[model samples]
Target chain A: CGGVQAEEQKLISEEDLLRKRREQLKHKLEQL
Target chain B: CGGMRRKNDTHQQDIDDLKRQNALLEQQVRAL
Candidate 1:
């Protein structure tokens, strides 16, 4: 159970990081 | 158990897809 929860949290963090990167890229593109 | 595993796999795939999009966006920004 603990392992499963840890795995879920890892995936969530990865997704969040990618989302932030996506937002930054869009903002940069707009500036250009 | 199977359902939980399937959900995790789906979430992983979603993250992968997002990562691919991010990479493409990065390339576009770099090219500009």
Candidate 2:
């Protein structure tokens, strides 16, 4: 689910791409 | 905001990410 999650994060239609990308980046940051 | 747009693009979804992102983005945007 690496790219899948990332792609899903970017392409998924459930939410906005910006927010999704932001959320993804946030989640990633927390992990770091 | 409008008919759960984004993936629900039935004259509902946003103009790409903005419309799609705003409504859906909120779901994840949280209260930052």
Candidate 3:
């Protein structure tokens, strides 16, 4: 359960980082 | 389960954004 919990956190962080990247890309597109 | 479910929802949002990014990139490549 401990390892599984940590893995979940990793996935959550990856999701958040990707979301930020997506937002930045969309913003750039708007500026273009 | 409640907070966990919200993270799952965020994960889905990331997946959706990834699809959108791919589509946008494809459109730009086509324009070129």
Best DockQ goes to which candidate?
1
Q: Which wins on lDDT, candidate 1 or candidate 2?
A: 1
- Residues A1-32 of candidate 3 have per-residue lDDT tens digits of 33545656776777667677666666666666
Per-residue CA lDDT of candidate 3, range B1-32, in tens? 34565665667676666767857765774475
List, residue by residue over A7-28, the lDDT tens digit for candidate 2.
Answer: 3444555444454665675674
| Fnat for each predicted structure, in order | 0.68, 0.03, 0.16
Order the candidates by DockQ, highest first — what do you get? Answer: 1, 3, 2
For candidate 3, give the lDDT of residue B8: 59
Q: Which of candidates 1 and 3 is the stronger one according to TM-score?
A: 1
- For all candidates, state DockQ relative to the true structure: 0.65, 0.06, 0.29
lDDT of each: 0.84, 0.48, 0.66
Between candidates 1 and 3, the one scoring higher on DockQ is: 1
Those runs of model 3 whose alpha carbons end farther than 4 Å from true positions after fitting are: B1-32
- Evaluated against the true structure, the overall lDDT of model 1 is 0.84
What's the distance in Å from true for residue B9, model 2?
21
The per-residue C-alpha lDDT of model 3 at residue B14 equals 69
Lowest lDDT 10-mer window, candidate 1 chain B? B1-10
